[PDB]
Design a protein around this ligand. Structure first.
Ligand SMILES: CC(C)CCC[C@@H](C)[C@H]1CC[C@H]2[C@@H]3CC=C4C[C@@H](OC(=O)CCC(=O)O)CC[C@]4(C)[C@H]3CC[C@]12C
Ligand SMILES: CC(C)CCC[C@@H](C)[C@H]1CC[C@H]2[C@@H]3CC=C4C[C@@H](OC(=O)CCC(=O)O)CC[C@]4(C)[C@H]3CC[C@]12C
Ligand SMILES: CC(C)CCC[C@@H](C)[C@H]1CC[C@H]2[C@@H]3CC=C4C[C@@H](OC(=O)CCC(=O)O)CC[C@]4(C)[C@H]3CC[C@]12C
Ligand SMILES: CC(C)CCC[C@@H](C)[C@H]1CC[C@H]2[C@@H]3CC=C4C[C@@H](OC(=O)CCC(=O)O)CC[C@]4(C)[C@H]3CC[C@]12C
Ligand SMILES: CC(C)CCC[C@@H](C)[C@H]1CC[C@H]2[C@@H]3CC=C4C[C@@H](OC(=O)CCC(=O)O)CC[C@]4(C)[C@H]3CC[C@]12C
Ligand SMILES: CC(C)CCC[C@@H](C)[C@H]1CC[C@H]2[C@@H]3CC=C4C[C@@H](OC(=O)CCC(=O)O)CC[C@]4(C)[C@H]3CC[C@]12C
Lengths: 253, 95, 52
């Protein structure tokens, strides 16, 4: 028993399958605790989850201190090189501040529950790191990592065009508003969801002044045409360019 | 898709709906509407509901949901799907 | 007015162009510069698609 339990529970494949089964179990418990009401004291599930977060923080501290350099500033540089480690630190920190907010009372509680939710995001994305044992999925996640740089470009170019319609749709349709921050929400609200489908068919070309709608403002006939040019230039000119750029790049990666 | 799709689904069912007794509809509401937005319908009227204008009160600071869903629609409908485009293309001659 | 109203419109058609001129400033970058290079080369391919 002693040798087989100690050999087996120290084979690195076995301790891997511990750590990933425990991490899936944490994901399921944290799913439950985020999609249930939460009373003033924490529940049992939340205690197991916060225990996971703080023990993970202790183990991070363990291996920061147990790193190979002798100087402490040297080892904190050693740990701040690798990417997933620094994202662990910022997320364990932000779960810690969610805990300190949610142990309080309202209005801080609803904010703390939102902080738990934005942790739910990142603790999902860490499964991409967890899926690095597969010889078939490891390359796919590495590919995604290479395609993100190409995205940085497309996104920038898109901004220029979206914003261009956004400004024009905002001024030509809406003629006489007062200085307010809703103009920015409308600048990126209506001409953004159009690149994925919904063209807002009612919102575009409403009939004006006939039983009565208000008499349609200035020269607002131009908004469908520059809209048409926008939908061509986004959905066909760029997205398709991005297909091409991914295919060329994907081959090498 | 399941990992990124689940991420947004859990997040949207936890921001928007803040107080529900545990029930099996919650998993359906995760695996509902987000999955159907990778296919063309963004569920536009559900997204940015008008709120607190003389309607039921604002759920929390629910401004996270359109933003992270915008990031999700970019990640889902552009990067991943275009990755499958490229993957199919380069394996295609090979097979 | 009502020229004022129409004087508002053709200001707004201008910011379409002056946004697109920021593509020139994106040209100086070592990497964004080549991406706008390919956009003009693909635009002649679309001109044939817009007729078909
Ligand atoms: C194209 C993108 C990248 C930038 C677009 C800029 C505008 C959408 C922003 C920039 C500065 C903003 C302004 C900064 C501060 C204010 C003061 C604010 O004043 C009040 O709320 C009180 C007014 C009063 O009653 O005295 C009104 C909104 C306003 C004009 C903002 C409206 C929105 C503005 C014009
Ligand atoms: C460069 C790309 C990748 C990101 C750019 C992000 C910004 C352009 C976004 C993110 C946060 C947004 C803001 C988030 C919240 C608000 C408050 C909102 O104002 C109100 O709700 C108060 C006014 C009212 O409701 O009457 C108006 C839109 C605004 C300024 C948004 C305008 C657009 C902002 C600055
Ligand atoms: C071939 C591709 C690149 C574009 C094809 C689409 C355009 C040729 C269409 C789509 C939307 C159309 C516009 C939709 C609405 C109007 C408003 C319309 O004005 C009125 O109806 C007067 C006011 C009223 O009583 O409603 C004048 C035509 C116009 C500009 C239309 C002109 C033709 C447009 C630009
Ligand atoms: C991400 C996926 C793969 C997992 C998500 C997990 C949850 C959405 C599941 C796991 C456990 C489930 C619960 C297990 C058992 C029950 C008891 C069941 O109770 C009753 O039907 C009546 C109870 C009573 O009134 O006494 C209600 C559904 C509920 C809370 C389930 C709701 C859905 C839960 C929370
Ligand atoms: C891992 C991938 C490849 C597949 C995953 C499948 C599951 C995510 C699906 C399949 C069966 C589904 C369940 C089938 C039936 C129900 C019962 C349904 O509950 C009720 O109808 C009773 C409660 C009520 O009506 O109020 C809630 C959704 C749920 C749990 C579904 C949730 C989503 C499930 C678990
Ligand atoms: C182009 C890319 C970077 C996407 C940008 C998306 C966001 C910058 C936008 C999209 C939809 C916007 C939201 C749409 C409407 C509203 C409702 C508005 O709600 C209130 O004013 C609440 C009033 C109350 O307190 O009752 C607050 C801003 C907000 C959340 C907006 C914040 C900014 C958002 C998230």
């Amino acid at each position: 028993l002693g040798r087989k339990i100690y050999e087996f529970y120290n084979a690195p494949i076995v301790k891997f399958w511990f750590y990933t089964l425990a991490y899936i179990g944490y994901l399921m418990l944290f799913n439950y605790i985020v999609l249930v009401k939460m009373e003033r004291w924490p529940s049992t599930q939340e205690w197991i989850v916060i225990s996971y977060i703080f023990t993970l923080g202790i183990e991070k501290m363990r291996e920061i201190l147990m790193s190979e350099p002798g100087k402490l500033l040297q080892k904190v540089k050693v740990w701040l090189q690798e990417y997933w480690n620094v994202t662990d630190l910022i997320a364990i920190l932000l779960f810690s501040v969610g805990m300190i907010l949610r142990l309080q009372d309202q209005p801080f509680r609803s904010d703390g529950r939102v902080i738990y939710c934005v942790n739910i995001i990142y603790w999902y994305i860490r499964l991409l790191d967890i899926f690095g044992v597969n010889k078939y999925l490891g390359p796919y996640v590495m590919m995604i990592g290479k395609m993100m740089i190409d995205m940085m470009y497309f996104v920038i170019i898109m901004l220029v065009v979206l914003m261009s319609f956004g400004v024009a749709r905002q001024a030509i349709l809406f003629p006489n508003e007062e200085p307010s921050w809703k103009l920015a929400k409308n600048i990126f609200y209506m001409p953004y969801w159009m690149i994925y489908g919904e063209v807002f068919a009612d919102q575009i070309d409403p009939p004006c002044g006939q039983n009565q709608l208000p008499p349609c403002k200035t020269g607002a006939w131009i908004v469908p045409a520059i809209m048409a040019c926008y939908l061509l230039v986004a959905n066909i000119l760029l997205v398709n360019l991005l297909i091409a750029v991914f295919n060329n790049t994907f081959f090498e990666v």
